[PDB]
């Protein structure tokens, strides 16, 4: 049945009824109910009742949402109890949507559920909802989630959003794309790096070293690259780089030899 009162926590319940003025009257109740070592289903009720009065209190929400995650932790993440936790974060965010920790905890819970398709969507909401100055807390989770999985097409689109606010991460984007065999996209981003005239990147590479990594990448992968006139860029290195002309003529031939275009290899 839906009704039932103890003999032992009635003073805390009656105290709240006469003193509806502070969270402390509920905290004394909630703190008491835990010392009893009481059932989790009763704790959810007292928290949701307290959060009906004090719906903007971050403390009770953060404690309640973490208490749900605590007692459900022994259940498999496929279980519907983890789905019910996410629906509780939605109700929390309907007040505390400007608090980053709730968004971060919501996103971590979606990762623990292992779903992908709308975990990305929860992240997209967090970016729209939080101040831009808070977004670095989100992006390091958002990218970390995506780069933990074999999700090349999604991660590409999310990264070129991310690099509009943190362009210094483009070096790490290149390293991701190479590991995911996105060689043509990796070479596109390297050219974007080489088109920046800063003397060195945050990974300690100068423009000549970044351009050498492009010539490396572009000559040794003839079959995998399509957007770049590989011959044109390497001849743009025989131009200007007068101290390595003999190397770059062989590097251009090496590209054609790996393409098995031996006729044009002899032309070079």
């Amino acid at each position: 049945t839906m009704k039932g009162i103890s003999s032992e926590d009635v003073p805390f319940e009656e105290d709240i009824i006469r003193n509806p003025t502070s969270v402390n009257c509920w905290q004394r109740y909630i703190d008491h109910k835990l010392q009893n070592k009481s059932p989790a289903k009763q704790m959810f009720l007292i928290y949701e009742r307290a959060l009906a009065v004090f719906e903007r209190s971050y403390k009770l929400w953060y404690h309640y949402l973490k208490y749900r995650e605590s007692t459900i932790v022994n259940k498999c993440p496929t279980d519907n109890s983890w789905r019910a936790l996410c629906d509780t974060y939605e109700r929390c965010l309907m007040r505390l949507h400007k608090m980053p920790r709730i968004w971060i905890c919501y996103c971590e819970v979606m990762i623990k559920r292992g779903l992908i398709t709308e975990t990305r969507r929860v992240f997209d909401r967090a970016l729209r909802s939080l101040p831009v100055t808070q977004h670095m807390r989100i992006w390091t989770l958002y990218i970390g989630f995506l780069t933990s999985h074999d999700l090349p097409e999604t991660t590409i689109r999310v990264y070129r959003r991310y690099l509009k606010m943190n362009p210094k991460a483009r070096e790490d984007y290149v390293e991701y794309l190479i590991e995911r065999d996105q060689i043509d996209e990796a070479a596109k981003e390297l050219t974007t790096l080489v088109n920046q005239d800063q003397n060195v990147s945050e990974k300690g590479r100068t423009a000549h070293q970044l351009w050498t990594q492009l010539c490396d990448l572009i000559s040794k992968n003839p079959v995998k690259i399509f957007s770049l006139n590989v011959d044109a860029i390497i001849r743009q290195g025989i131009y200007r780089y007068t101290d390595q002309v003999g190397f770059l003529w062989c590097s251009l031939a090496d590209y054609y030899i790996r393409s098995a275009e031996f006729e044009r290899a002899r032309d070079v």
């Binding site: 003999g246 190397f247 062989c250 031939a253 090496d254 030899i257 393409s259 098995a260």
Partner: peptide, 28 residues
Amino acid sequence: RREEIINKTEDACEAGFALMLEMKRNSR
């Protein structure tokens, strides 16, 4: 670079001619 450029165009032949043989068979 004298040793770099020769030996790295030697494997380039190896990777290249291994692929050439695959192409010459698939044409059949």
